[PDB]
Amino acid sequence: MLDATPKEIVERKALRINPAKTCQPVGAMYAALGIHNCLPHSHGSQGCCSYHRTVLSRHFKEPAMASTSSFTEGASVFGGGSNIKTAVKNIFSLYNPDIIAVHTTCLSETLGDDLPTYISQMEDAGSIPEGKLVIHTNTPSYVGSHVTGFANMVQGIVNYLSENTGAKNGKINVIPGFVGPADMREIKRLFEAMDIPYIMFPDTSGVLDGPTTGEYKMYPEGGTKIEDLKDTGNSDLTLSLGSYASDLGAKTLEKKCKVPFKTLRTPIGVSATDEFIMALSEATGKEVPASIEEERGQLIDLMIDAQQYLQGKKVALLGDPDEIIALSKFIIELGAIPKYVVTGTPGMKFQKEIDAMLAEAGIEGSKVKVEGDFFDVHQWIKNEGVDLLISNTYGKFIAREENIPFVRFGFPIMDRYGHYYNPKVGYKGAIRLVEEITNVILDKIERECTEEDFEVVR
Amino acid sequence: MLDATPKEIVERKALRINPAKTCQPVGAMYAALGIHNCLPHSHGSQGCCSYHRTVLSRHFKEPAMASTSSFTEGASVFGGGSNIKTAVKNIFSLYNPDIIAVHTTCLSETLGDDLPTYISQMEDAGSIPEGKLVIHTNTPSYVGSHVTGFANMVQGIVNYLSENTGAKNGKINVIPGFVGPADMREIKRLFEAMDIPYIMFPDTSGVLDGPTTGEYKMYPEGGTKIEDLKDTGNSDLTLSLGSYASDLGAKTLEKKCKVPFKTLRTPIGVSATDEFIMALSEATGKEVPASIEEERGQLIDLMIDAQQYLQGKKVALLGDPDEIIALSKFIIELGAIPKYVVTGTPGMKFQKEIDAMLAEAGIEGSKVKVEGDFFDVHQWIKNEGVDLLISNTYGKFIAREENIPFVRFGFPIMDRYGHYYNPKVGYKGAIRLVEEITNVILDKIERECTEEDFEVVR
Amino acid sequence: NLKDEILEKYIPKTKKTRSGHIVIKTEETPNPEIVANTRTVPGIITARGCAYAGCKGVVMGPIKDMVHITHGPIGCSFYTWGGRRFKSKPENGTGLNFNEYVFSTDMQESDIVFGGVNKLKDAIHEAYEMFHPAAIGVYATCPVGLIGDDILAVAATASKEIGIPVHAFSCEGYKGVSQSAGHHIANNTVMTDIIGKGNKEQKKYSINVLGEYNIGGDAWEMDRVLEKIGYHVNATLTGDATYEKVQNADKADLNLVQCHRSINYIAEMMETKYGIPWIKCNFIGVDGIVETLRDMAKCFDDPELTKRTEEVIAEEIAAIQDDLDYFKEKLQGKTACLYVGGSRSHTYMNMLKSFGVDSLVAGFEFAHRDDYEGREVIPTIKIDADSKNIPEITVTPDEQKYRVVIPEDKVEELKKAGVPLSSYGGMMKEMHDGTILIDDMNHHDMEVVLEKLKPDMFFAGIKEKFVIQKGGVLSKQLHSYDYNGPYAGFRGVVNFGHELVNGIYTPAWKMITPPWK
Amino acid sequence: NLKDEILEKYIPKTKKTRSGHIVIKTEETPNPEIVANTRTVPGIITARGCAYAGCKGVVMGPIKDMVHITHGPIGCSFYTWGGRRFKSKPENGTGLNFNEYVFSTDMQESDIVFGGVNKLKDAIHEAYEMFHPAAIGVYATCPVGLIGDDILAVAATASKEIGIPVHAFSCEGYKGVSQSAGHHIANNTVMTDIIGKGNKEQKKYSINVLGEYNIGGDAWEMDRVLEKIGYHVNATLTGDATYEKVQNADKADLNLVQCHRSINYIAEMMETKYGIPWIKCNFIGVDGIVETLRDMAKCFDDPELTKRTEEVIAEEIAAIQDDLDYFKEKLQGKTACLYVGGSRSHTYMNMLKSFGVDSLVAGFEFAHRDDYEGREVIPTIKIDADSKNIPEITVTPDEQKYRVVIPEDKVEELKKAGVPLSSYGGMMKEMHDGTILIDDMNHHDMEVVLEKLKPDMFFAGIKEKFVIQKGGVLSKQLHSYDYNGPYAGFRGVVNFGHELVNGIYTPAWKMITPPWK
Ligand code: ICS
Ligand code: ICS
Ligand code: CLF
Ligand code: CLF
Ligand code: PRO
Ligand code: PRO
Ligand SMILES: [Fe+3]
Ligand SMILES: [Fe+3]
Numbered sequence A, B: 001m002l003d004a005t006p007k008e009i010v011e012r013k014a015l016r017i018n019p020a021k022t023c024q025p026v027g028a029m030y031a032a033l034g035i036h037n038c039l040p041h042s043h044g045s046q047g048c049c050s051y052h053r054t055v056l057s058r059h060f061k062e063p064a065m066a067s068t069s070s071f072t073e074g075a076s077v078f079g080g081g082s083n084i085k086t087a088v089k090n091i092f093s094l095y096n097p098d099i100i101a102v103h104t105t106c107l108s109e110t111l112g113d114d115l116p117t118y119i120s121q122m123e124d125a126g127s128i129p130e131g132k133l134v135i136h137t138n139t140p141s142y143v144g145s146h147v148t149g150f151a152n153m154v155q156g157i158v159n160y161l162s163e164n165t166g167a168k169n170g171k172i173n174v175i176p177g178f179v180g181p182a183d184m185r186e187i188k189r190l191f192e193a194m195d196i197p198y199i200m201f202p203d204t205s206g207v208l209d210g211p212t213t214g215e216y217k218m219y220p221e222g223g224t225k226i227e228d229l230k231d232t233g234n235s236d237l238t239l240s241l242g243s244y245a246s247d248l249g250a251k252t253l254e255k256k257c258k259v260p261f262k263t264l265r266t267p268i269g270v271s272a273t274d275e276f277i278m279a280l281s282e283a284t285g286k287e288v289p290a291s292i293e294e295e296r297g298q299l300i301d302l303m304i305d306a307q308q309y310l311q312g313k314k315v316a317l318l319g320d321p322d323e324i325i326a327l328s329k330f331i332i333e334l335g336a337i338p339k340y341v342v343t344g345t346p347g348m349k350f351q352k353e354i355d356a357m358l359a360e361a362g363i364e365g366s367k368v369k370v371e372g373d374f375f376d377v378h379q380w381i382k383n384e385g386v387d388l389l390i391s392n393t394y395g396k397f398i399a400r401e402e403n404i405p406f407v408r409f410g411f412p413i414m415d416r417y418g419h420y421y422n423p424k425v426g427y428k429g430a431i432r433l434v435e436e437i438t439n440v441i442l443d444k445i446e447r448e449c450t451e452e453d454f455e456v457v458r
Numbered sequence C, D: 001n002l003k004d005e006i007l008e009k010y011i012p013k014t015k016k017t018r019s020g021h022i023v024i025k026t027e028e029t030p031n032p033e034i035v036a037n038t039r040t041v042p043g044i045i046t047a048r049g050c051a052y053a054g055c056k057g058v059v060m061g062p063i064k065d066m067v068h069i070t071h072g073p074i075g076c077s078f079y080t081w082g083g084r085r086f087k088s089k090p091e092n093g094t095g096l097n098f099n100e101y102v103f104s105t106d107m108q109e110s111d112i113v114f115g116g117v118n119k120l121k122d123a124i125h126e127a128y129e130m131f132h133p134a135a136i137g138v139y140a141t142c143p144v145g146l147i148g149d150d151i152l153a154v155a156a157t158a159s160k161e162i163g164i165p166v167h168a169f170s171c172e173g174y175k176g177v178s179q180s181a182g183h184h185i186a187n188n189t190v191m192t193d194i195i196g197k198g199n200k201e202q203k204k205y206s207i208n209v210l211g212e213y214n215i216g217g218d219a220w221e222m223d224r225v226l227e228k229i230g231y232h233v234n235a236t237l238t239g240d241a242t243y244e245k246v247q248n249a250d251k252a253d254l255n256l257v258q259c260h261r262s263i264n265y266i267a268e269m270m271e272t273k274y275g276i277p278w279i280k281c282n283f284i285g286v287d288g289i290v291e292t293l294r295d296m297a298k299c300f301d302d303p304e305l306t307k308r309t310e311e312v313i314a315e316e317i318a319a320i321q322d323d324l325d326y327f328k329e330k331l332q333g334k335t336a337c338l339y340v341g342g343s344r345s346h347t348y349m350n351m352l353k354s355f356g357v358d359s360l361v362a363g364f365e366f367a368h369r370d371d372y373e374g375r376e377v378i379p380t381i382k383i384d385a386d387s388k389n390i391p392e393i394t395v396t397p398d399e400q401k402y403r404v405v406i407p408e409d410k411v412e413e414l415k416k417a418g419v420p421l422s423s424y425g426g427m428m429k430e431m432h433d434g435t436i437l438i439d440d441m442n443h444h445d446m447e448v449v450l451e452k453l454k455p456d457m458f459f460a461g462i463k464e465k466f467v468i469q470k471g472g473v474l475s476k477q478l479h480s481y482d483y484n485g486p487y488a489g490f491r492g493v494v495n496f497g498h499e500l501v502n503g504i505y506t507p508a509w510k511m512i513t514p515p516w517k
């Protein structure tokens, strides 16, 4: 498998192969689905919109709704103003969201379409029914990655909705970053266990992991509600989880509404979850309850119980930067070695944070690459093998070709059922990861060992 | 592997090979650890105690404490009265449990020891400190299985402790049966979600699934408290989950304390979990809340989303009767086929229930065997293969020999890390089971398919 | 009626535009005229894709020893990484295969600003030294056209330096109104710059399967049967194709057209240039397959071919008749809707009819009037403003190579006998009276159909699948086959039937309503 | 004073009976006396097992081509299904191997009352017909000797009828005070009924390793090194052993005793009956292995073999020295306690010393005074009431077989050199001054040791492992090797050391306290 990939490496300057990222707009579409009664709208040629809806459905095994401006060549040269205006009238009348959340593509951005103008003309002409809203963000696909797209849509939400009306809510805002609905559910559970009022946004729990009732519901029960989105301006503090995904939204909200904000890693593993929990207590004076302490202690117990299988193991990891920074820390905390560490998403944060945790652990010679791809990591592996691979679905080709125990992680995972009901964050998610990691390590051991080496107990 | 196992079946009437059961006492030792501040005591030769403690340690990766009478040939002649008296004095003084829960072995049962006499003489002699308790059950290992041992210990709890003082606690009693601590937690969450007050016993959560805090704690935080076990007699109703493990103690509770009881299947799968929820609602007139309805609907969504990999699949199942009866029903619910269905635990109910659900689903030609073993099932498989194997750890040998996707289930699982944090019961447990079953099925497909048939999406 | 009901909620402008895209068959008017292949209405929630998907993702991508480089930002590339299940293997156990990769210039800001021809050039070179493929393709995307990168020029320059073909395609996503434009754009360049460029000697009983992309093994299955009967499958465009075999595409006596919409251009042009005739084929469904095999036998006449033809059909049907009876026992009376790209809504109908299923609704996403109404209407089709910039090309008869494969009297004589030579009747004719066709069916339309008609099953794609099933209705995908296949050929019928029966009879459908309800 | 601190919480009676089990080594009392192999105090939470485990579970079980039938209820059988990790393979690649099974008569209430001998007869026949093994073992459990079953008689009848050996063992679990009695019980019947019976011809430099069970592949690592040197390993009792090879144990010139406790009974009798001598060996720890091989070369007395010996030592130690320096680097100054069975507490001591680890505490579960104090004290050993009814067997020189492998005079000069011929020095002498021994160490004891001495590591078993680690201290298992091995031999030292370092430096030990403290 992957036969064309050579062991001997010639560095690539231009040819991108098997990317460890995708483009902005699906991140914005995902963010917009984290608003209740919202229809995401893609302002570009309809190809983008179909592709981006498709990846979400493939991952979640759920519907994923969005509309598009459906640019034709004419609009792609002279502007897409009529397209979007035509779209809004068709959307509100046929589909009746409470809010349309617009993002853009390489097409409308290259063209320089002026959405604030289009939207105001739309406002002034009455194309937007009473009590209905239209917001936007700009999401050029040639900049950054889908994570950047998520971040831009969050800002967009802040720009249009967040109002400090002076009537303080006594809540903490939390921007959970580019994590799954299971993870959002776990973060909320922890807020609730701590007895802390909060507003989470965006929130795709109840939207992209919902039940079958026998009636298709276009706008699912979930999503952060518009009125709560507005109220974010009245909170005491915003927690930004994952700098790449969440900071821009949080800084914007401070600028606009003077809500202070602290940045925290995506809470994956011991230190990152500890730092998240310590932040909630330090910010509210609230006591960390017994239930949460028990979970942490079970994780530590598991880390120690399973230690022999983790110590010194070489791990290749690819994915999105917030999640991979945190996961790489967790790997080090389990006694293991982040050997090859890559995100397709550009930015120095990752290079720095990763280089620094390795230095600190005294780990030498690991390869860290920002804007690296799956072809990179495969060539590395061919030169020096690893004991574990963690990535989205596209790692399965390397796992099979090189025979490496494989953990599906992050976005998108399109080839398994029920994974989207499991968190990777928190002490609870950390416990799941350690189980999943040791499971796939032991599965390989017991498959391949000599029969006389086969064991009852492990 | 398992080379000596021939395909041609000569039916065995005397030679038991690779049993799908173990003996009573460990079931009673497990039940006793579901009492807070309790030290289980094995009244017989010490080999039993060590073996039974060891399997619990190997399954949970946790301490599992118990004392023993340490019979010598001297007792096999004068009985073990002096041993139990000497033990009880050393136990209270060195280890200070709040309660000693005594069970027996084939040795003391064969010998005819008289624990109620020894106990009364200990009371009279002053050997049991004030504020301290000593209870007992009888668990001859030549009768039934470890499930029966558990059932017996639960009966012994009732005999000694259950007290109708006339008051109304407003609570429902739940006897969870021979299930793991994860299952106990999940059942309690459901009660607590339904907003129904309850007393669960035995309850091993917080005992065999506990944190590492850096201090060893002989009696862990969990376990049903003596005061509440007394208070069981003052309850509106008892729900007996899994008739083999639980009915004896519920019946005894009615006799002793006039508390009525309803019998229910271990809640695994759709109908069994539904039946449990409906019992709770009907017993209290309380409404099934939204959270619980969402879980059920997520499970249905998963059963449908994953349907193609389940329909018509042939399953071999071995284990404990309450759990395998329900899991077999779930298998049918998933559209799959319980092809070979075995428990080592004797009794007619397994036979009737499994036969009946197969007949109802129009399924012909499955082999159901009570007091069957792992050798039985492997011979069957050799004559016609299956698509999935579900058992405890000892199935791993067949899984490897015959190349069958394998799901570790029930007791004991001694070869993986963190499984004891995951329920198999409830809608949540059911979702976990479907993910695990489809995962192992897809792992094998993607491992063995030709490279050209390899797939991104599944 | 049902069309009225679908049209109800549309705003007046929209109602007026959409009305012609929805037609109900009646005896009063057997083959009504439909409106198709027009712009998508903005905001309507179409299923449609773009011209880039039609060109790179559909026609060219399956060519397995050619390196396909997307010139654009990363999405266009990533979203063509394995989602469309064209199966490929190393030719002869040893040839190149790039199926498992996607390639991109991963355009950045600086490329939009100072142009991207330089990175493109270096990508082409990087790809060549690293892989040394039979050929390289370069595919434009939305912004490539706007910023003015001249990709034909880059490809020419590099092709000169590296010594292999480099094929540029101007398939910017905004061209045309759908994937269709992409097909056309691909066919243009394949015809002129690839086909006929080979040098292998034509063999006897040589056929091509045109517009077959080997989704889940479909093409290997039809080959399996064709090669038994005795044909030489000179080329399949482009399922599991080598570059060289597409070059040698002219080395055949008969072209078979499975997907008309995607490949008809090349079928017309090959007959014009080389004299090679074609027939519509349908290797989906027993009836489709048998009829196709018999048509091929008439075109060739050879009576051994004719004998093996009936021998092979006999044994194949023998092997699976029990399954076929089972399908019909378990599905009899059930009703279906079909909405697939531009071909499969029609080609799957014979199979469902044989199973006893009544197809109440059908539609294409991006097919043209000729696919709905038949090729006879082509002289009446008016290219509209949105597709007028799709380049038309003309070919002339090759002065040397052209040849009369079938005597023109034979041609006309077979057309009498019902052989579909250079023709295609369209989906409407095959449909039952009172049924409904919906072009560019959108979410609104689908929901009305489901509520009013309550079909037992609705075949479509990934975007519709869970919308439908969330409503308690079975939806099997006819693009991805739900990660199964083949669905074409004799074996395909059995694969499709067993998956459909398993879908219908999944127990969970009856478990949806909780017992506290 | 640590002795005092341990005894403190015991009630008077218990304090008095335990005191003798705990001794602190001092230079003035170089050879201190301990109490051992007495009955367990009821209720004190021992680690001990039963006679059945010592016999069927430990000595007999590993004989791979013999079927071991437990005559009892199901647990005695289930709890011996793979928990003890003796490794087996089919001899030469083709021999029978029953390691993956457990066999039982699964006694029921009827059997307890009416007797079980008919189910046992039937079991034995069923197993012969099904498996046709070299032999069948029948093992008593607690109920068997009280309900009146005569398993010796039952085995004879059946062995008559079937044509192969059927060995009965009266190892009811209440016999003796521990697994020890089961060792003795097994040694008896093995000696008289299996050793000698072999009809095979000796070989050059033929040796046996006694009391070695191939846990995690220990024996294969020994054998490997032994063969490079040139030896022939006539038999290993009983790790990876075949029945025939145990029958042929007499075909050797030197017996190596790894586990003294379990096998010494047979060491002695083989010397008496066949005139074969024996030395204590310790194939664990580099120091122990070299010292061992240096000893054997002498008993053989052979310039070549003796030279080949010191050669293999060189290339083996060469191959691993870098690892040894690492362990010492990462472990120097660490402290340890060891509570293993009846041998490993001692045999692991030299290895830990070469890592620069200080062993502060040691004990045996079930060893006798001669394992603590050495065989010189055997004359002072009084068998007590609880082990009185463990049978003693007597053997006498076999005429046609007996031999004087080492001339009388020669023996005494090897003993002169320090070669442990028919001798074992005991754990105590190898321990540092001021250290402490604790026989039958119970939970209470261990806890006091853990608070007072704060070892860095505490080796024991599965029941203690997690109790120790819940308190933040590393416990590596030295019965199951935490599902690793070999830990014996040269490669074993590497395995062991790497596991120990990894345990010590597991990061999570430092993360136990949450940051909100
Ligand atoms: S080419 Fe076309 S949409 Fe004819 S763009 Fe589409 S692999 Fe469909 S109905 Mo996906 S005109 Fe092929 C098609 Fe049919 S991608 Fe496949 S299934 S037979
Ligand atoms: S036989 Fe003995 S308890 Fe010498 S009963 Fe026990 S496989 Fe131990 S210290 Mo488990 S006298 Fe062997 C033993 Fe040592 S089972 Fe093993 S490790 S070297
Ligand atoms: S309609 Fe088609 S798929 Fe869309 S861009 Fe255009 S050619 Fe491409 Fe590629 S990077 Fe992403 S997905 Fe687009 S927004 Fe820019
Ligand atoms: S000390 Fe030893 S292990 Fe104990 S019984 Fe006795 S021989 Fe056996 Fe077997 S079935 Fe179970 S484990 Fe016992 S209680 Fe009856
Ligand atoms: O990490 C995850 O699981 C989710 C999936 C969509 C966005 N991120
Ligand atoms: O998980 C389970 O089901 C078993 C029951 C007892 C011990 N654990
Ligand atoms: Fe779903
Ligand atoms: Fe633990």
Ligand SMILES: [Xe]
Pocket (backbone or CB within 6 Å): A012, A013, A014, A015, A016, A017
């Ligand atoms: Xe690159």
Ligand SMILES: [Xe]
Pocket (backbone or CB within 6 Å): B012, B013, B014, B015, B016, B017
């Ligand atoms: Xe049996």
Ligand SMILES: [Xe]
Pocket (backbone or CB within 6 Å): C253, C254, C299, C300, C405, C406
């Ligand atoms: Xe032809």
Ligand SMILES: [Xe]
Pocket (backbone or CB within 6 Å): C476, C495, C496, C497, C499, C500
């Ligand atoms: Xe199907």
Ligand SMILES: [Xe]
Pocket (backbone or CB within 6 Å): D253, D254, D299, D300, D405, D406
């Ligand atoms: Xe010797």
Ligand SMILES: [Xe]
Pocket (backbone or CB within 6 Å): D476, D496, D497, D499, D500
């Ligand atoms: Xe170790």
